[PDB]
Amino acid sequence: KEIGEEPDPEKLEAFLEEKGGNALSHLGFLGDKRFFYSSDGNALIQFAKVGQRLVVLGDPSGREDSFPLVIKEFLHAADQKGYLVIFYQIEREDMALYHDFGYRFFKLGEEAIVDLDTFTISGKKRAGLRAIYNRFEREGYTFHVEQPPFSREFLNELRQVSDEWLGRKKEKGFSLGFFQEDYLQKAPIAVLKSEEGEIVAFMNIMPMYREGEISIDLMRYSKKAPKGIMDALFIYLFQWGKEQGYTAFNMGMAPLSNVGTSFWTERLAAVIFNNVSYMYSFSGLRSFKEKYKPVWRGKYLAYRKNRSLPVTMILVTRLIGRRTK
Ligand SMILES: NC(=O)[C@@H](N)CCCC[NH3+]
């Protein structure tokens, strides 16, 4: 029998609320990743199979005290089938869990974490964001957060916006969300309507698996959405989040800066610049998120062989592109 369990929404939902989760836990409702529950029943590893190589999405979910156990069991179970195990988008404070198994780390980027309490558009340099907000407020756009269950009529209106936003592009997966009705029923959906009540944009609000932190997964808008649409949505989102009592917002991962000062090869360099599309949501520009003055939280790739790092990145990139062969 193949390693891991079939993705089960009911079991996952029960687990994430009774044991807790992380930033990438909600992505398990896409049904495109296999699950590996620990024998303790307190920890969970989500992953995807690519040939003889398994790619884990993030750190384990659940009780952190069972994290060494689930990693031990998962790696052992993969040792039997002779599979290579890769960990994608883990955090620094959990490096000790993987270092003992001889894993190396590579910084993929940083997540923009915006303080909702100290965020404002009243700043002297915040004249740009305040102008965008005022214009949307002037033209009569309204922001609303809807709760599941959602009707077909509502989903149809979201699909029209989504399809128009996608264009000729197809959906990505694994570490990114896509338009699935089952998945969309699992969380609140925030919409932006015009004066005529026409939905021109939508976002799905991702569950609190931390302190007072929230985030979104999908952010899509139609062609009739005004310029600065993405900036406007985050402003409305931050306003709503602060109103609900949330402390922080995760704007998703952004590419690293040029550091400022080598293990760099031409192989690795070409792969990374090719990759700048599949790992950074909303905008591939770090400056887009940086202007919100966020606290950067690094995400790392856990690998074993350094010479196989360029290939590893390609396999993960294609996995996000929904191809495993
Ligand atoms: N999951 C997301 O961030 C979606 N808003 C876009 C994914 C497909 C991009 N071509």
Coordinates of N, CA, C and O in Angstrom, one line a residue, residues 36-43 69-70 73:
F36 N -0.6 12.4 6.4 CA 0.0 11.4 7.3 C -0.1 11.8 8.7 O 0.6 12.6 9.2
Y37 N -1.0 11.1 9.4 CA -1.3 11.3 10.8 C -0.3 10.5 11.7 O 0.0 9.3 11.3
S38 N 0.2 11.1 12.7 CA 1.1 10.4 13.6 C 0.3 9.3 14.4 O -0.9 9.4 14.6
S39 N 1.0 8.3 15.0 CA 0.4 7.3 15.8 C -0.2 7.9 17.0 O -1.1 7.3 17.6
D40 N 0.4 9.0 17.5 CA -0.1 9.7 18.7 C -1.5 10.3 18.4 O -2.3 10.5 19.3
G41 N -1.7 10.7 17.1 CA -2.9 11.3 16.7 C -3.0 12.8 17.0 O -4.1 13.3 17.0
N42 N -1.9 13.4 17.3 CA -1.8 14.8 17.6 C -1.1 15.6 16.6 O -1.2 16.9 16.7
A43 N -0.5 15.0 15.6 CA 0.2 15.7 14.6 C -0.1 15.2 13.2 O -0.5 14.1 13.0
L69 N 7.8 13.3 16.7 CA 7.3 12.0 16.5 C 6.8 11.7 15.0 O 7.1 10.7 14.4
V70 N 6.0 12.7 14.5 CA 5.4 12.5 13.2 C 6.4 12.6 12.1 O 6.3 12.0 11.1
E73 N 8.3 9.3 12.1 CA 7.5 8.2 11.5 C 7.4 8.4 10.0 O 7.5 7.4 9.3

